Design a protein around this nucleic acid. Structure first.
Ligand SMILES: [Mg+2]
Ligand SMILES: [Mg+2]
Ligand SMILES: [Mg+2]
Ligand SMILES: [Mg+2]
Ligand SMILES: [Mg+2]
Ligand SMILES: [Mg+2]
Lengths: 285, 264, 314, 126, 379
RNA sequence: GGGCUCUGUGGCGCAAUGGAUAGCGCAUUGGACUUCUAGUGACGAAUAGAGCAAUUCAAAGGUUGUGGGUUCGAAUCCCACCAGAGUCGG
């Protein structure tokens, strides 16, 4: 058959003013330290009831904004971008691209700005909810869900995340008193030394974003950005760890910038970074 | 009978009463991955949607707690009446906020009218001494997080492999589902443990106030465990004060557990 | 042959080596049921004093286990005596653990206790209200010997040549030790290559059993300093074919990274790369080291909220 | 150390794994001498092809079951359950849960003990 | 000024030559000796500034001094009877070794600075050669040795008594480079050269029966504590010494008697009351004079050669560290390696022409191209 | 070098308003750890290190770019300048 899905709470006029004169103070997560055994009489129950009643009020909160602080946008799904209907604001110094005389955004930038309350996204003359925006923009043709999660996580801390355009790149050893025995026969290769021909298997993991530190936000040149801070590849926590061939390929591609891996474990983001290492042995001690 | 929306395999909850009902009745907790309408520049606390693992969603569908559906698409047949209703709603919400602000201005004016007239008369006296000496952007709009329109979705059949439910049939999902189901029947709470080098975190109670006691690691009854995995996992359990719990389902249906601890 | 340089020994121990210079002393070891042990005193204390090799059997770090009791020292510290002052419990175990082999020597119950009741008249001071000590003769030998791992043994034999392994009173060669150690340990080549590479640079490697890793690298030794690196080894090809011995997930790597940052160490990954042109019969010779490379990779954890400024060091 | 009586007892069980009997003798040494236990007997298990030690930490307590394993071996969970049941029937008492100690011994004789019981055990406190 | 001395039996005339003076000694009547060298009657012997001399008589004599002495006096208190008895016991060991086809006595003389070690060595050697023996003199004193220049260790085969003025005739000494006036700069090198001298002495004893039966007398450094004591034990072992003569130091006697093998005869002897303490400056002057005597001979009888050596023609090392020829080499002594064939001093260095000028006891070319730089300078 | 649009708030990323209290997060400092680890000690032993549902709590931090204007009252509305980013065109 077909199931009916009722949804949405329409904030009234009086419920938008109360949501505009809101606070900014985050409620404390656990009111004190955590317990060990679940056997209690009233302390456990009361503290749990409090911790739960604060949560069920924190989540039932809507975004309310002014109609003049909102940059009206429009999602064009055949060209694959969101085209602004007004001059952008402060986010135009690190986000967006201008082509053919109009200001344009990628889908993930548009979604991130919709969550932060920066743009007022539309589609077929009707504004997109955050549910419908999550549904429309987060396909596999445009940008996935794990990639948007990592992009948003980094952007909410003040980084500059830019799509990676592939065109961007008595302790002796023996009795004799001698020095520097040098018994080594094993030579130490490097990471990119031999990865120009390892690119022939172009498939699997690939660089996605370019990340700039939070310092560089103030003087970010969007047409001559410079060498970034790190390049980012995005996986899931159950996908396999990259082999040495994939490591050498991504390192050769990235070039001189360090490479970072963003794992997403059912909603938890964890960043690792494989870096080549060689230590000039020891001294005379 | 709640409603979960499944799209390409991921299950998200977009309501608040649904998350409250889940947590306080069925013992499922999920993870909030969204942003906060009050804290949109931090990663400390997050908001809706709530992301349910595939095992949580299958478990809730089996016992009859939720009705999985598949993300609807725009009708495209009922669109013009939507526009008419939207224009009417927008104009009414815009023309009724003009009253609230006016009455609030009246209250504030009549509240601090005496300091205003104080400063006024004081500046008038200063003037006497000197003479003797000489709509839009103010109209609020809501960016909803759950679709404000009722849409018919077709019910998803989870016990078959498809495009919008790729899990049914895979061995890892069946293993994790057996262990998750058994642990959930025992009265525990569960979450994900990637940082802790395992599969689940088992709580004596609600994880807001209680701390996990075990790290659960789902295994196949015949898969070979490297002993170094055991040593590293036991050391991580000792470092954080959690027992390492091993789980594997038997052919007769029941699961067998084991606890690994340190000794001297 | 190609084993040492200055004062190059042979694979066979016998014979002169043209060494009219500072004469050292090569050390001896015997392979007892797939383990290597050395018994001579100065050899033990110097193998542990030189390069920090091996580990004593009973004692934790060094070969410093004594029969004496740490508790019974504090009762009569003052009197000018020597080491052995033991309790009568282990002496009662010292009584019978020899007496049973006395019965196993074929002689019957008539004397088994009388040989020992006379033997309670190379020596120990078993002490006994008054606690008296009557010097006892040692019934059963409790000698102490050092034990070396396979990789350290082969490093001293091949790369250094001052160690000699025995087998039924017969010293063995280099390639026979290679094949024997590969038989008893199906992963001797890889771990020995990693060990040789890391020790040739002055570092001191020790097994990382307690942390779940493969090796632990000490700057100057366990007493001098602590370990700085934990190593995880594997073997691959020049076009990177090969199955890793322990398959690495990322749960394993999260766990290892956590429990290594806790003990303040660095989690390294050491890949060994050999040519695709390699054979299964040229590799069985230790000379195969020259055609295989090494590559290290430090796996660390990037904390998102800490790296968004640059200095902030005042 | 080959002349030690208990070593003869271990190789008397007719098992046939010299590496495992040497590992088991190393664990016997580490328990009896260093950690100073009492009444440590060696008893085999031919139904699982194992050699195992029984002992008593403090005289007057219950018997402990310690099964040594080298670092190259590996244990399916079915083998763990098999050893649990075997040890339960070995020591005798069915009141206490099924448990045993896993003494992992590396080449240089460094032993790590891990206590595998059956069920849910609270970590440090209970 | 002329002074005549009448010496009774078993007495000695002790005298010291004043700075910048020379004193002539003449035996007029009877019999007398200087450190076991017999004096010829009516022969004048000349002693130069800083000479310290003891003229002993077993039977009585008349001696004449002509010149200015800082001090001159007759002493009856002398250890000469104990030194004679020591020599007589060593001669019994030589006669026994001759009869049994064995090696002769290896004698090590030990004790602190300024106890007469080199004087006792000279006396024991002189008495041995007077009895027709041919002992090897071994010199382990790198600071004040008499077999070669300072900074060296060596051996000399003694065929005749020492000359009264010049000392032992230096004919083809075995000499090794140590490079410094104290063993403390490189104790491993010092012990290594000590063992090498013992090995080459043993090889000489195998082919030369007369050297074997005669044995050796080993002079040692005055460094008797810490690593200096360990170097004496090393020398005793390396030479397989039969007799250790300890001068004026009971502590060292008891240490050596405890730490040496029971077959090693340790003897304590007093120093002579005529032993003079030597200042650091006097010791420096004696080193500079010994280096001068090497180039210029006894009283200037040699004419050393000055010539240029190219940097390309030689390899220079410090004990092996290669040394690049530089202006810092000026006034350093270099050993010419074959043992050492001889010594040269760098007098100047020309970096433009890549040459250094040397003073050499022999004309160009140098006999060998391997050079060892000393920490010792000669101007 | 010209025209147009946007921006400037604590060390950094940022909130705020009809126009009527200048605070959130990261970093910093300081506690508690129902904490863990590291040394050569057989009667809870001075010391640093690590902390991601073994985590948790607090304090401190201001040239609101500069000047002027309306206003009882300006981070907030307007004007000019200073600095920066994008675009168009020469
Ligand atoms: Mg501002
Ligand atoms: Mg500022
Ligand atoms: Mg700022
Ligand atoms: Mg925390
Ligand atoms: Mg104000
Ligand atoms: Mg202003």
């Amino acid at each position: 058959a077909a199931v009916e899905v009722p949804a949405g709470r329409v904030l009234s006029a009086r419920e938008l003013f109360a949501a505009r004169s809101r606070s900014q103070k985050l409620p404390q997560r656990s009111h004190g330290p955590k317990d060990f055994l679940p056997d209690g009489s009233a302390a456990q129950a009361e503290r749990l009831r409090r911790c739960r009643e604060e949560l069920w009020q924190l989540l039932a909160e809507q975004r309310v904004e002014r109609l003049g602080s909102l940059v009206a946008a429009e999602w064009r799904p055949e060209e694959g971008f969101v085209e602004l209907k007004s001059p952008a604001g402060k986010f135009w110094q690190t986000m967006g691209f201008s082509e053919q005389g109009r200001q344009r955004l990628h889908p993930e930038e548009a979604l991130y700005l919709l969550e932060c309350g920066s743009i007022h996204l539309f589609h077929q003359d009707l504004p997109l909810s955050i549910q419908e925006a999550y549904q429309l923009l987060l396909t596999d043709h445009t940008v996935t869900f794990l990639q948007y999660q990592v992009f948003s996580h980094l952007k909410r801390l003040g980084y500059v995340v830019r799509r990676f355009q592939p065109s961007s790149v008595p302790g002796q050893a023996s009795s004799p008193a001698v020095v520097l025995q040098h018994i080594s026969v094993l030579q130490t290769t490097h990471l990119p030394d031999g990865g120009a021909r390892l690119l022939e298997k172009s498939g699997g993991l690939e660089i996605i974003f370019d990340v700039y530190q939070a310092d560089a936000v103030a003087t970010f040149r969007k047409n001559n950005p410079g060498k970034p801070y790190a390049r980012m590849c995005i996986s899931g926590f159950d996908e396999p760890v990259p082999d040495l061939c994939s490591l050498k390929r991504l390192s050769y591609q990235s070039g001189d910038v360090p490479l970072i891996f963003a794992l997403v474990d059912h909603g938890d983001i964890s960043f690792y970074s494989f870096r080549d290492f060689t230590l000039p042995q020891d001294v005379g001690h | 009978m709640l409603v979960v929306e499944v799209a390409n395999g991921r299950s998200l909850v977009w309501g608040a009463e649904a998350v409250q009902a889940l947590r306080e009745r069925l013992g499922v907790g999920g993870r909030t991955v969204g942003a906060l309408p009050r804290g949109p520049r931090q990663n400390s606390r997050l908001g809706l949607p709530l992301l349910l693992m595939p095992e949580e969603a299958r478990l809730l569908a089996e016992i009859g707690a939720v009705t999985l559906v598949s993300a609807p698409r725009p009708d495209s047949r009922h669109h013009s009446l939507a526009l008419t209703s939207f224009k009417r709603q927008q104009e009414e919400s815009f023309q009724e906020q003009s009253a609230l602000a006016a009455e609030a201005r009246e209250t504030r004016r009549q509240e601090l009218l005496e300091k205003i007239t104080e400063g006024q008369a004081a500046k008038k006296q200063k003037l006497e001494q000197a003479s003797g000496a000489s709509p839009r952007s103010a109209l609020l709009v809501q960016l909803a997080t759950a679709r404000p329109r009722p849409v018919k979705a077709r019910p998803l059949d989870w016990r078959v492999q498809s495009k919008d439910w790729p899990h049914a049939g895979r061995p890892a999902h069946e293993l994790r589902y057996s262990i998750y189901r058994d642990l959930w029947e025992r009265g525990f709470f569960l979450s994900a443990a990637g940082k802790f080098g395992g599969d689940f975190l088992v709580y004596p109670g609600d994880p807001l106030r209680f701390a996990a006691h075990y790290i659960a690691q789902c295994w196949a009854p015949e898969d070979t465990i490297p002993l170094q995995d055991l040593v590293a996992a036991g050391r991580l359990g000792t470092s954080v004060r959690k027992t390492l719990l091993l789980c594997s389902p038997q052919p007769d249906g029941k699961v067998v557990y084991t606890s690994l601890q340190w000794a001297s | 042959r190609v084993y040492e340089t200055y004062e190059s020994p042979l694979p066979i121990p016998f014979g002169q080596d043209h060494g009219p210079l500072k004469e050292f002393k090569i050390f001896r070891a015997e392979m007892i049921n797939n383990n290597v042990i050395v018994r001579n005193a100065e050899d033990i204390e110097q193998l542990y004093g030189k390069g920090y090799f091996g580990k004593g059997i009973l004692s934790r770090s060094r070969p410093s286990f004594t029969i004496s009791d740490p508790k019974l020292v504090a009762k009569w510290k003052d009197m000018k005596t020597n080491m052995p002052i033991i309790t009568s419990k282990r002496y009662q175990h010292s009584v019978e653990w020899a007496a049973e082999l006395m019965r196993r020597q074929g002689q019957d119950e008539s004397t088994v206790r009388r040989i020992l009741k006379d033997y309670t008249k190379e020596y120990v001071l078993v002490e006994e209200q008054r606690n008296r000590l009557i010097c006892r003769r040692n019934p059963y030998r409790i000698f102490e010997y050092l034990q070396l791992s396979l990789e350290e043994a082969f490093f001293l034999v091949y790369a250094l040549g001052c160690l000699s392994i025995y087998y039924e009173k017969e010293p063995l060669t280099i390639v026979k030790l290679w094949k024997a150690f590969t038989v008893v340990q199906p992963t001797f080549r890889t771990t020995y290559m990693a060990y040789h590479y890391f020790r040739s640079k002055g570092w001191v490697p020790k097994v990382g059993l307690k942390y779940g890793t493969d090796l632990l690298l000490y700057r100057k030794g366990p007493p001098f300093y602590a370990a700085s690196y934990s190593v995880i080894i594997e073997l691959v090809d020049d076009h990177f074919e090969g199955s890793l011995r322990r398959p690495l997930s990322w749960k394993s790597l999260a766990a290892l990274s956590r429990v290594s940052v806790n003990v303040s160490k660095e989690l390294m990954l050491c890949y060994l790369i050999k040519p695709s042109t390699m054979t299964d019969k040229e590799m069985e010779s230790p000379e195969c080291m020259k055609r295989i490379k090494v590559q290290e990779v430090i796996l660390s954890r990037w904390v998102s909220s800490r790296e968004r400024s640059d200095q902030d060091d005042l | 150390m080959g002349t030690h009586p208990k070593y003869l007892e271990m190789m008397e069980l007719d098992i046939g794994d010299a590496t495992q009997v040497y590992v088991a003798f190393l664990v016997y040494l580490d328990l009896m001498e260093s950690k100073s236990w009492h009444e440590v007997n060696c008893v085999g298990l031919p139904e699982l092809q194992l050699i195992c030690l029984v002992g008593t930490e403090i005289e007057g307590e219950g018997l402990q079951t310690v099964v040594p394993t080298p670092i190259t071996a590996s244990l399916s969970h079915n083998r763990i359950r098999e050893i649990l049941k075997a040890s339960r029937k070995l020591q005798g008492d069915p009141d206490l849960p099924m448990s045993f100690t896993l003494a992992i011994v590396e080449s240089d004789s460094t032993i790590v003990y891990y206590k595998l019981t059956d069920g849910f055990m609270l970590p440090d406190p209970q | 000024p002329t002074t005549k001395f009448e010496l009774e039996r078993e007495t000695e005339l002790r005298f010291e030559v004043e700075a910048s003076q020379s004193v002539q000694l003449e035996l007029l009547t009877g019999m007398a000796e200087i450190f076991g060298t017999e004096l010829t009657r009516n022969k004048k012997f000349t002693f130069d500034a800083g000479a310290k001399v003891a003229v002993f008589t077993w039977h009585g004599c008349s001696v004449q001094l002509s010149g200015r002495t800082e001090v001159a006096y007759v002493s009856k208190d002398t250890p000469m009877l104990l030194y004679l008895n020591t020599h007589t016991a060593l001669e019994q060991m030589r006669r026994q070794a001759e009869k049994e086809e064995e090696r002769g006595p290896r004698v090590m003389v030990v004790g602190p600075t300024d106890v007469g070690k080199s004087t006792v060595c000279r006396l024991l050697l002189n008495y041995a050669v007077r009895l027709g023996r041919r002992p090897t003199y071994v010199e382990l004193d790198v600071g004040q040795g008499s077999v070669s220049i300072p900074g060296t260790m060596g051996a000399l085969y003694i065929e005749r008594p020492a000359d009264v003025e010049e000392g032992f005739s230096i004919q083809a000494p075995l000499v090794y480079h140590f490079g410094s006036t104290t063993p403390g700069t490189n104790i491993k090198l010092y012990n290594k050269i000590t063992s090498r001298l013992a090995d080459v002495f043993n090889q000489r004893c195998e082919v030369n029966r007369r050297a074997s039966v005669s044995g050796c007398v080993i002079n040692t450094c005055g460094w008797v504590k810490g690593s200096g004591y360990q170097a004496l034990v090393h020398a005793a072992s390396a030479f397989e010494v039969d007799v250790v003569v300890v001068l004026d130091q009971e502590r060292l006697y008891n240490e050596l008697k405890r730490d040496l093998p029971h077959f090693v005869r340790t003897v304590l002897l007093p120093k002579s009351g005529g032993v003079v303490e030597r200042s650091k400056d006097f010791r420096r002057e004696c080193r500079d004079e010994r280096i001068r005597e090497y180039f210029y001979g006894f009283r200037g009888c040699f004419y050393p050669h000055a010539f240029n050596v190219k940097f390309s023609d030689v390899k220079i090392y410090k004990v092996l560290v290669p040394v690049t020829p530089g202006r810092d080499m000026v006034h350093h002594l270099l050993s010419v390696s074959t043992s050492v064939a001889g010594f040269i001093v760098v007098t100047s260095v020309d970096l433009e022409h890549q040459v250094f000028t040397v003073l050499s006891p022999a004309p160009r070319p140098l006999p060998k191209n391997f050079l060892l730089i000393m920490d010792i300078r000669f101007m």
